[PDB]
Design a protein around this ligand. Sequence first.
Ligand SMILES: O=C(O)[C@H]1CCCN1C(=O)Nc1ccccc1-c1ccccc1
Length: 133
Amino acid sequence: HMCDAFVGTWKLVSSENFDDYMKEVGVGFATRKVAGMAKPNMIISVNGDVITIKSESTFKNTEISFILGQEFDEVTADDRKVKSTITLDGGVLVHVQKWDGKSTTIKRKREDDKLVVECVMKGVTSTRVYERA
Ligand SMILES: O=C(O)[C@H]1CCCN1C(=O)Nc1ccccc1-c1ccccc1
């Protein structure tokens, strides 16, 4: 029952400072522009100890499956090859991605009927708000 309130199908309904976040991460111009248009569907499911998060959009379709606290390989939508660890901290799913001596943290939080996602790279924060599909 660890992630019950996250399970479901969610659709992006607002974005703030995302282009700047992607710049900070190192995404190039053309990818930033196309990726910034996307309205991804985030699909979260749990089977035993395995959590699966899928993101489907015109830009890219991605899927990760993981056990909390257990590092894995991820190729991100923008084609970074990262080492990821996802934990639960006070009811927030905290996803840390490490690559090339860099790190970014993506926090997924349930707030009212929304799922609020905060993406942080150094001093740059972006907020991505999702609602139930
Ligand atoms: O898209 C989102 O809302 C954010 C928050 C949940 C995971 N995610 C990303 O991984 N986004 C990205 C991060 C870096 C570069 C590109 C993306 C991206 C952009 C459009 C579609 C899918 C991922």
